[PDB]
Design a protein around this ligand. Sequence first.
Ligand code: ADP
Length: 285
Amino acid sequence: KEIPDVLVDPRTMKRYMRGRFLGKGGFAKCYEITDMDTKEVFAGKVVPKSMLPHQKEKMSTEIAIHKSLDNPHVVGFHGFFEDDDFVYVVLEICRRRSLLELHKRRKAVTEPEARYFMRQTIQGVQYLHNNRVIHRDLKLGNLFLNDDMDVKIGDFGLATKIEFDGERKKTLCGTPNYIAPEVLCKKGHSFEVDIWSLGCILYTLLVGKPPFETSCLKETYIRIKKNEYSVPRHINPVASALIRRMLHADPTLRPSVAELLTDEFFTSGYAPMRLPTSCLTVPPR
Ligand SMILES: Nc1ncnc2c1ncn2[C@@H]1O[C@H](COP(=O)(O)OP(=O)(O)O)[C@@H](O)[C@H]1O
C-alpha cells in the first residue's frame, strides 16, 4: 500500500498535500500536510484499516473526545476522514517533537525548565478535568512541543469522559512508568490518576529517570502498587515535597489540578515565561 500524495475527503472536499515524514507509533504514521488552496500546514495521522468493530470503537471514541476539545495547551483537532484504505486525522502541527526526546538528549533538566513545562501541562490538564475528561495516558511522549516550545497534550486514545458526579472507571490502561496504583488494582479510579502521572512526569524531568523505572516490567508494577520510590536528597525540598504529594498512595490525598498551580514550587523560584529552542539539546543560559 501507498498513502496518496493528495488527501481528499467527501465532507469538507479539501485537498491535503502529503509532505515530510514526522514519525510513527501505535499503528499510525504522521506526515506534515498542507492544504493545497490556502497553504495551511497541519499534522496528518494516517492509520491503516488493517490495523483496525472492537479497535474501531476505541478510535471513534478518541476522535469524539479530541474533536470536542479547544485549548492552547492541547493538540488542536482540525478534522477527520477516511477513504477505502486509510483514516486521516488532521491535527495541529508540533514540529519540536515531544518532551520525551528532550528528556533523552538532556537527562535531568534545570528547575526553571520543569516549572515552565509542568505549568503549561497542568493548565492543559485543568482544562481537561473541567470538561470531565480524564487523559489516563499522560507521559513525556504525549506532551508535544511546537516551534515556540509550547507544550501540547496529545493522544487521547485512552481518554474517557465522565457524565455523572461520582463515576469510577475500571479499565486497566496506561504506560507502565506512569500508571496509577488504583488502575493496576482494578478496584476503580477517577480524575486523580492524571495527577499521579503528572507526578511521574515532574520526577522524570528533575531526576532524569522515571520513579519506578526497572529492567523488569513485573517489578515496576510491584513498586507502583507498594508505592516504592525515593526522591534523591539532591532535589529541592519544595519540589520533592510536591512530588511526594502527587505520588500519594491514597488518591484522595493527592493535590487537585487547581491546587497544583498555586503550589510553592511554582511561586518561589525563577519561572520563565519563554524557553528557547536550544532547550531541546542544551541547558538554557
Ligand atoms: N500533532 C503532532 N504534530 C507533529 N507530529 C506529531 C503529532 N502527533 C504525533 N506526531 C509524530 O508521531 C510520532 C508518534 O506520535 P504518537 O501520537 O505517539 O502516535 P499515535 O498517533 O500512533 O499515538 C511522534 O514521534 C511525532 O513526531
